[PDB]
A paper describes a structure:
The Atg12-Atg5/Atg16 complex has E3 ligase activity towards Atg8 and LC3 lipidation. Rab proteins are key regulators of intracellular membrane trafficking processes and are also involved in the formation and maturation of autophagosomes and their fusion with lysosomes. Rab33B interacts with Atg16L1 in a GTP dependent manner and therefore Atg16L1 is an effector of Rab33B.
Since Atg16L1 is an effector of Rab33B, the GTPase deficient Rab33B(30–202) Q92L mutant was used to stabilize the Rab33B/Atg16L1 complexes. The crystal structure of the Atg16L1(153–210)/Rab33B Q92L complex was determined at 3.47 Å resolution. There are three Rab33B/Atg16L1 complexes in the asymmetric unit, which align with a root-mean-square deviation (RMSD) of 0.60 Å. The N-terminal end of Atg16L1 is positioned in the proximity of the opposing Rab33B molecule, and residues E186 of the Atg16L1 dimer form salt bridges with nearby positioned Rab33B R94 residues localized in switch II, while hydrogen bonds between R193 of the Atg16L1 dimer and the carbonyl oxygens of Rab33B A64 in switch I are formed. At the C-terminal end, the Rab33B aromatic triad, composed of residues F70, W87 and Y103, forms hydrophobic interactions with Atg16L1. The structures of Atg16L1 bound Rab33B and free GppNHp-bound Rab33B 34 are very similar with the exception of the F70 side chain, which adopts a different conformation to accommodate Atg16L1 binding. The Atg16L1 helices start diverging from residue 189 onwards due the large side chain of W194 and W194′ facing each other at the coiled-coil core and repulsive electrostatic interactions between E197 and E197′ and E201 and E201′ from the two α-helices.
Author numbering:
A (entry chain J), C (entry chain I): 159 to 208
B (entry chain B), D (entry chain A): 31 to 201
């Protein structure tokens, strides 16, 4: 009924917001890992030059 | 001033970081994480009177942490050390894949390559029989060395292994 | 409305599971961030010697 | 070759990386990302005939990416450069917070501190009036410099700023 409907609707909103926060965190992980790769790649090229 | 590049290839969690750290730092690393990209470790030695800088490359074993670095590994390589976990048959069965990767990136089939089985101190959990790994080592014309990064106790001490490979390279 | 009631419950269950995955992902974020700081801190100490 | 440490503090996305890269690389960076920890850039200069190595530290502005590095910033620091975004009043109001961070980490008032407003090329979106930032700069006894990493047309070019700071440091 009414009261069940709005309860679920509010939970749906929190569910969506919570997903977005997981998306941001996964984005930030990919940023960190890929940036680390750029670091070690440059260092690798420096050493292979010698 | 000669620098010899020695790469360390193998699956994840086999002990590449612990072996390279054992040779350069002389001690077993206590708290270890997944290697991201490469970990460069260098050690100077005097072989036959000549001073030589051994540069070990602790490559990654996780595909998410090594997909972009593969060809950086195989440039001006002087020696390749394959590592498998003696307590993990799956890491042993992955060696043909690494040998193929080594075939596809190398272009000289003479550089010294060695096979190393790690974690032999865990004698109660060894899964790769010595004869099987020895027969495989012979197939690809490599010496087999069963050792442990955490405790070389009267069994192919780590110092002897890398010194043997570097003593080969001076030639 | 009984169909709405169990439907709600399933979303709640999925919500809790999503929290667990976001916790692990946030853990991995801290894993990465702290490792970056370690590398940068050592570089700082090397430079602070001069 | 005496080395001078100059740290660059400010909020996130104000343009610290673009200013330091402009001074050291002599060109505007075509692409940047969020600085993690520190980002070290060095440039050799000739001040009054003496060769000096200016060591700019591009600190981070995001609290989660700098909370552990603060005391590495303020150790043996020779000069401090505070930066705000001229197109962001909120970054200007954050300057008292950064000055508090500086005072809490330094007990000596002998080192030069300067205040710099970036992104002055966006003349249509400037939000911080020159008089207000000057009045604040005067309060804490700092010189004010309004400039741009990209195009400071007749407006306090970046090299002139850091050369002035290094020239004052040599004395
Ligand atoms: N008992 C025993 N455990 C070892 C030995 N060497 C490594 N380990 C364990 O192996 C685990 C991780 O080994 P790593 O050296 O990180 O393996 P790795 O090749 O660096 O793994 P990746 O970096 O992900 O490729 C840790 O739990 C270590 O304690 C060893 O010689 N003996
Ligand atoms: N128009 C204009 N944009 C600028 C100027 N300087 C920097 N930017 C812009 O500022 C943005 C990012 O600036 P950053 O140098 O990365 O700022 P930051 O201080 O390093 O940021 P954090 O590392 O996160 O603390 C980019 O969009 C640049 O284009 C400038 O002089 N003029
Ligand atoms: Mg490793
Ligand atoms: Mg920056």
């Amino acid at each position: 009924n009414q009261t069940l409907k709005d309860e679920y609707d509010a939970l749906q909103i929190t569910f969506t917001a919570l997903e977005e926060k997981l998306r941001k965190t996964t984005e930030e992980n990919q940023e960190l890992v890929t940036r680390w790769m750029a670091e070690k790649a440059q260092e690798a090229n420096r050493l292979n030059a010698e | 001033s000669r620098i010899f590049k020695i790469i360390v290839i193998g699956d994840s969690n086999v002990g590449k970081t612990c072996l390279t750290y054992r040779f350069c730092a002389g001690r077993f690393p206590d708290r270890t994480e997944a290697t991201i990209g490469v970990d460069f470790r260098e050690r100077a030695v005097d072989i036959d009177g000549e001073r030589i800088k051994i540069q070990l490359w602790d490559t990654a074993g996780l595909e998410r942490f090594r997909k972009s670095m593969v060809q950086h590994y195989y440039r001006n390589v002087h020696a390749v050390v394959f590592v498998y976990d003696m307590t993990n048959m799956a890491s042993f069965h992955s060696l043909p894949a690494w040998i193929e990767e080594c075939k596809q990136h190398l272009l000289a089939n003479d550089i010294p390559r060695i096979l190393v089985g790690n974690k032999c101190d865990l004698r109660s959990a060894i899964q790769v029989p010595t004869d099987l790994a020895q027969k495989f080592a012979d197939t690809h014309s490599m010496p087999l060395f069963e050792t442990s990064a955490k405790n070389p106790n009267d069994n192919d001490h780590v110092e002897a292994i890398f010194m043997t490979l570097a003593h080969k390279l001076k030639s």
